[PDB]
Amino acid sequence: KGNYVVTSH
Amino acid sequence: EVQLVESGGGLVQPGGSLRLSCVTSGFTFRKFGMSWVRQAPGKGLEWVASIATGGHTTYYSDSVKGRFTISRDNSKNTLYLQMNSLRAEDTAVYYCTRGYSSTSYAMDYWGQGTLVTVSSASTKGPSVFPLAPSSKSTSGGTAALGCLVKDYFPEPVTVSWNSGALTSGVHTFPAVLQSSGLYSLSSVVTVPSSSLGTQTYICNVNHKPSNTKVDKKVEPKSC
Amino acid sequence: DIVLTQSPATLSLSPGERATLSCMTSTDIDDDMNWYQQKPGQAPRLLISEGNTLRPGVPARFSGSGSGTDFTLTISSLEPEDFAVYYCLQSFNVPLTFGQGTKVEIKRTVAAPSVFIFPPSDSQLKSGTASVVCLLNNFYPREAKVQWKVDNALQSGNSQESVTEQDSKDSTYSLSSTLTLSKADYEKHKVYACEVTHQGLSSPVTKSFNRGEC
């Protein structure tokens, strides 16, 4: 589930 | 408003490399995730890679992992795809795309795409062969005739009939890629059988990559 | 990887009718389903994003429903511009995966093909190859089977088919099938035949020629 980043943090 | 413009595509040999670019306008590029998606000829959409706003975090499909590298330059509004060790099956239109939200790569905007063709074939013009109307064409009925445009590379070719004066009843088929790595296609037209002895039917074939321009008159075969 | 299964692959309908398109996933993806429309030569267009959210600018007749494993795109009443291919996309996890597409095409009355067979030209034979071409002209629906026969022996593996898009005027398809043989192999047989099976034909139609005839 939701294993990804779009906006770097 | 929002524009995504791809460049850098073209023809490459298996084993070769290309680098695609996509230059964007109409939004603050550094605030959006970006992706490449490709579409092989006649096939559906396939995600290739994605990159986060900062340009460090990246994601790849298993098909391209280790061969393709996605990167971005936020000061130039530019997204890149470095494509190494290319294979025939990487042939496709490649689209630059924008993730629609700060948390999703689901694409809202798409570029027009850039075509990448991976093949060991050399440029070659077609041979054009008549598909002659049958001598048994029905009296007062409808006949078919055409041209076989065989063994050319790369796409595309264009075919018209009678220099564009004949369009009704014409069917020009999608090319097929043969096992040789060359393409072939057929173009046909149906005409009144009663016209076969008096009207002229000429297919005008142009293959620009090879500077091949051929007009072939297609007529009843004499016996 | 999550598999998206779109059905039916082809949806045949008329302007004004309701279109229902299904997309099923191999695992629960909550509501992270997205739907695209694509026309020939054009880039896809996003219709519906995660949460069955209708995109600004997209007509109200489009709507998404469902979540979890079973998703639906509904077009309440088809406009002519809606005949196109539609793809679903999950954005729940990487790798991002698409369904294989549903083509919404124009339904019309049954139309049998006319059928024509063409021998290889002498000029092609001169060069060492023989292509035999069978044309199926202006038929509907799309399902059509071409079987090549050479002195009545059924062929396999040595032909390729291509098909046109639905004709803008009469909504029919046309198809070409090409049988490719060596010149040597072409010249050890007499009778070349194309047998066409289509539901508009009460029984299959065969067109044939004998090598060396007028």
Side-chain angles (χ1 to χ4, degrees):
Chain A
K1 173 184 66 53
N3 64 345
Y4 74 83
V5 166
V6 176
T7 295
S8 296
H9 54 268
Chain B
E1 179 155 24
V2 173
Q3 277 252 283
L4 305 180
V5 178
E6 300 101 333
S7 69
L11 172 57
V12 57
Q13 312 286 124
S17 297
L18 284 169
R19 189 184 82 157
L20 311 186
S21 292
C22 173
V23 181
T24 73
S25 66
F27 61 100
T28 305
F29 177 75
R30 65 191 165 80
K31 287 175 191 296
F32 292 78
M34 301 291 295
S35 307
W36 292 97
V37 176
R38 69 183 177 185
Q39 179 160 44
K43 302 311 181 175
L45 301 172
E46 190 183 80
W47 169 79
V48 172
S50 292
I51 181 164
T53 51
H56 311 104
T57 299
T58 61
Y59 298 96
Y60 297 98
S61 80
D62 283 338
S63 294
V64 308
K65 173 179 53 175
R67 300 187 296 123
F68 292 15
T69 298
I70 189 170
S71 62
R72 67 195 293 159
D73 182 337
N74 285 347
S75 75
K76 301 189 189 296
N77 272 23
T78 302
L79 175 74
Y80 302 99
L81 189 66
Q82 181 64 50
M83 309 170 66
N84 297 331
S85 303
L86 281 164
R87 304 157 183 167
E89 60 269 20
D90 294 317
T91 294
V93 177
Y94 287 73
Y95 296 100
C96 171
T97 69
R98 189 186 79 167
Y100 86 105
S101 82
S102 63
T103 56
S104 178
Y105 288 119
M107 304 91 203
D108 57 2
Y109 290 97
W110 300 63
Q112 279 302 115
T114 187
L115 184 64
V116 171
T117 305
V118 185
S119 173
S120 53
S122 313
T123 302
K124 180 191 175 303
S127 288
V128 181
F129 303 115
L131 297 171
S134 173
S135 62
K136 299 167 185 166
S137 297
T138 300
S139 191
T142 299
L145 57 91
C147 282
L148 174 59
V149 183
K150 196 175 159 55
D151 294 341
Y152 65 89
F153 181 88
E155 289 268 61
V157 298
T158 59
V159 181
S160 61
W161 287 86
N162 294 345
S163 294
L166 178 63
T167 50
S168 173
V170 172
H171 300 297
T172 297
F173 293 95
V176 292
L177 174 66
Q178 309 169 112
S179 58
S180 62
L182 307 172
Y183 296 86
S184 177
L185 71 70
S186 276
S187 181
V188 301
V189 60
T190 52
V191 301
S193 298
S194 67
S195 75
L196 294 178
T198 38
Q199 293 303 316
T200 289
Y201 296 106
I202 301 165
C203 73
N204 322 106
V205 178
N206 198 0
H207 184 241
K208 287 178 163 178
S210 70
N211 203 37
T212 301
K213 234 199 171 212
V214 169
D215 296 318
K216 174 69 54 165
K217 179 168 152 159
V218 173
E219 55 185 23
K221 198 184 182 185
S222 202
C223 298
Chain C
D1 309 354
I2 296 166
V3 178
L4 275 51
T5 305
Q6 284 188 253
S7 65
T10 303
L11 188 60
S12 305
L13 294 166
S14 301
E17 289 195 90
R18 178 179 257 249
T20 296
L21 292 72
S22 303
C23 185
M24 295 160 197
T25 56
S26 59
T27 198
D28 192 297
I29 62 159
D30 191 18
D31 62 353
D32 292 321
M33 183 62 79
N34 309 271
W35 289 96
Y36 292 88
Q37 173 195 79
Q38 190 180 30
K39 303 194 179 173
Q42 298 192 11
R45 181 196 187 196
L46 176 65
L47 304 174
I48 309 291
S49 61
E50 305 174 334
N52 288 325
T53 304
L54 178 57
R55 305 308 301 164
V58 177
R61 66 178 176 276
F62 293 94
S63 73
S65 62
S67 74
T69 52
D70 189 14
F71 299 82
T72 299
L73 174 71
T74 299
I75 309 174
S76 62
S77 180
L78 285 164
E79 296 294 319
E81 62 269 21
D82 299 340
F83 293 84
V85 177
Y86 296 80
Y87 293 98
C88 52
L89 164 69
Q90 67 83 23
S91 52
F92 178 75
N93 258 18
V94 289
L96 267 40
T97 48
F98 289 92
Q100 294 185 36
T102 288
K103 180 188 183 173
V104 182
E105 57 130 47
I106 297 96
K107 178 92 181 309
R108 60 151 284 163
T109 53
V110 171
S114 45
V115 185
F116 305 83
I117 186 165
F118 301 98
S121 65
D122 294 346
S123 46
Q124 183 185 18
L125 281 181
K126 183 87 143 45
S127 46
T129 307
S131 302
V132 194
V133 176
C134 187
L135 166 66
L136 285 58
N137 182 76
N138 296 11
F139 62 89
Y140 186 90
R142 171 64 182 85
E143 293 66 44
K145 184 212 298 158
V146 173
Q147 171 68 69
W148 285 100
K149 297 166 174 172
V150 175
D151 296 318
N152 303 295
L154 279 70
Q155 305 293 295
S156 60
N158 51 5
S159 58
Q160 295 194 92
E161 293 192 345
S162 176
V163 310
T164 50
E165 293 303 300
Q166 271 189 301
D167 181 78
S168 58
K169 271 37 208 187
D170 68 18
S171 300
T172 64
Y173 293 98
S174 296
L175 180 152
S176 71
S177 177
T178 302
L179 177 74
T180 302
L181 296 185
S182 56
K183 175 177 181 271
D185 191 30
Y186 179 71
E187 293 183 332
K188 51 204 185 190
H189 297 98
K190 181 184 165 177
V191 182
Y192 288 82
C194 178
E195 179 202 71
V196 172
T197 304
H198 185 270
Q199 200 274 333
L201 299 168
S202 56
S203 45
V205 173
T206 304
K207 299 293 175 184
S208 63
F209 67 87
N210 307 318
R211 188 178 57 82
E213 82 175 333
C214 176

